[PDB]
Design a protein around this ligand. Sequence first.
Ligand SMILES: Cc1ncc(COP(=O)(O)O)c(CN[C@@](C)(CC(=O)O)C(=O)O)c1O
Ligand SMILES: Cc1ncc(COP(=O)(O)O)c(CN[C@@](C)(CC(=O)O)C(=O)O)c1O
Lengths: 396, 396
Amino acid sequence: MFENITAAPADPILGLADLFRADERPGKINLGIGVYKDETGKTPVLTSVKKAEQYLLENETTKNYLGIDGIPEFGRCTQELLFGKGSALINDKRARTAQTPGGTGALRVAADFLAKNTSVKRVWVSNPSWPNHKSVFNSAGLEVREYAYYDAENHTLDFDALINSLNEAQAGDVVLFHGCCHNPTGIDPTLEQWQTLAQLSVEKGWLPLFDFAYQGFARGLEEDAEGLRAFAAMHKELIVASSYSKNFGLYNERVGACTLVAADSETVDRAFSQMKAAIRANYSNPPAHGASVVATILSNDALRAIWEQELTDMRQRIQRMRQLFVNTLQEKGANRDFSFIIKQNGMFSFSGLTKEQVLRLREEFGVYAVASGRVNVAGMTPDNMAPLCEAIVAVL
Amino acid sequence: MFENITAAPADPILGLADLFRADERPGKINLGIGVYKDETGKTPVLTSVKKAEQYLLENETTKNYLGIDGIPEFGRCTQELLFGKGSALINDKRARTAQTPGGTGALRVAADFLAKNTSVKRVWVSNPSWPNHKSVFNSAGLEVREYAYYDAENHTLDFDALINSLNEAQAGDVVLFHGCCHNPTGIDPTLEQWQTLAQLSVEKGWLPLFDFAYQGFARGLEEDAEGLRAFAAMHKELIVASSYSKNFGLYNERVGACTLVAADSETVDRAFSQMKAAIRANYSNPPAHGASVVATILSNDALRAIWEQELTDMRQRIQRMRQLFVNTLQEKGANRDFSFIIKQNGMFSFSGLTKEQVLRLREEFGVYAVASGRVNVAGMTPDNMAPLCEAIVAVL
Ligand SMILES: Cc1ncc(COP(=O)(O)O)c(CN[C@@](C)(CC(=O)O)C(=O)O)c1O
Ligand SMILES: Cc1ncc(COP(=O)(O)O)c(CN[C@@](C)(CC(=O)O)C(=O)O)c1O
């Protein structure tokens, strides 16, 4: 049976962790996968997290199965994060949430649900976006069509080109929106532009799918849900796939959520019974530990106050790092002006380097970025900033 | 979009946990989902597990992503469990393992791999078996065909009928074997019968798929892998989907493994690059916590000696419970003789009750079994044994 199988090409992102483990030369720099590093280049488990784990260690008496959609505190806490505490979607019981293994698991259970219970056959993704968007939706059988987004030559959101690309989206198909910190560009629609995409989406009959992995990294929890909340004021059905991998530093515990919204409880419930049947045939029920950590920090104001400050320390150090990177590049004499980096959001910057510039940065300098020129600003530290900028200036 | 969606029927097993939470009357008995209970009717987190968690709490410095196939200690430890420490499959580097969320996740990543990288279009499952076998393989696009297995009228393995059913399986398709403690019958092939199914499978070109969730519950770790090991002496390719949910009491942490075997490393590696591409498009990479617990107990002889005795205390209490159930049923005057229960393996017994007998046991007596008459013997305790047998005698 297996004689004739080909070798999958490597993942543009996770495969990059592979020559970084395989390269010797201690000056190695890793600007690849989006994982936060502190000033000492480490990705610490958060204090609020270590405390929540302490509590669970002493206070847990069973590891008996959780039930398809996971722990209920978790769902009500993520709905209040995404929607706001006093929301009409929450009071009208219009939203149901299934705890999933990470945001990727949530995009896949949404993809499998859609493919099997709906008439959807096309998902629209931005050009560019996270490469795994394409594989998840194609795994479920959906075809992925692309919309314009980034104005490269000018480093902005090409709102015209976005709208006009989208004029080809049919009533009834899915458009994927990034909640905040668009991956890979760091450019997000302003609130006026989000309510324009909100108005146009109910007019055209697109079903909105939000990928919301970075809540907290652009401006703050409340401010980052603004585009999604504008969308949930105008739509009767939406799906949001969110993750707590980055804002709780819980990367490897696989903690996310798939929230289904429908017009009333009876419908969302009937729709969610199907979403649960899709989870049962995939992984059965979700991993308890990372989601219990989130539930216990979010259910306790002392732990939530500490967590909430660790998240704004993360956001601010990253913002310090992209201030420093532009300045150091200018002090290392760059032909190009990189002022635009400072306008982008979250942990990455779309540098503008060509594929051959990032190939030789790796080969010649041990500097690891993703082939699209996406650079992880959250992995830059005051110490590696001078070798890194010097590698970049020598390649421009 | 969601207006026209139907409501999935309830899961024959997990749905049962729902009227148990919804029924009042304190005499409720739950013989539904296969979850071990101790003499006090609780499903404790194991001591070796609480200790491993202690170690992890103090000794872990990051929650940074694990990488598609999960933690490497875990894979080498499960290969040595499944195959034996001095195995030729291990020394020849013929086997690769991806850590998955539970055994269900491992059956699904094997199903998705097969569907997408192989010419397989049919999977053969026993009649009867675990109902979710059918949904997992149909989710990936495979069709499920069934083979005879249980001789109901006599309570044995119908080996003839099994062979003759299987004579319709084509060269190149998948036959699903339960490693030990067949779910739902508790009847397993003896070693002579396993090597007969081993000889016939290489002769007919079936690819063997082993579902191995209960290693340790029939006779012991080593003795329970005997059928699988006989199969890995004769086959060049095999897939085993195993779980640590029950033998480590780690149910809700979603800990399992999908082990791919091929004829040589270069091939198994080329095949596994594809299995990893399927995981990436599903959940990205696995939940660390439950699999780190397993790795640290299995990597340390003090923790492994303690764990290993907690597992044989589980197995033995269950064996005490099915001794007690037959006896008490006979002391409560059953028309039928239930001596056959004592011959079955693992945590369940295929009672022989009709669907209407288990419906009224629930309705009239608050006694919860699965609709096939599958009863969880591991949930029977010295205290609930007399109400339970009296409910059963009043229904025969
Ligand atoms: C846009 C987006 N959505 C989801 C995820 C994955 O979240 P998870 O499953 O909860 O871990 C990501 C993650 N992107 C990373 C950080 C890592 C990856 O490739 O999975 C990246 O861009 O390097 C994003 O970005
Ligand atoms: C035969 C078999 N294979 C896999 C699993 C699930 O293992 P997991 O994903 O690691 O939890 C099971 C589990 N069967 C249970 C105990 C629960 C269930 O329906 O998932 C049952 O029979 O009640 C089995 O049996």
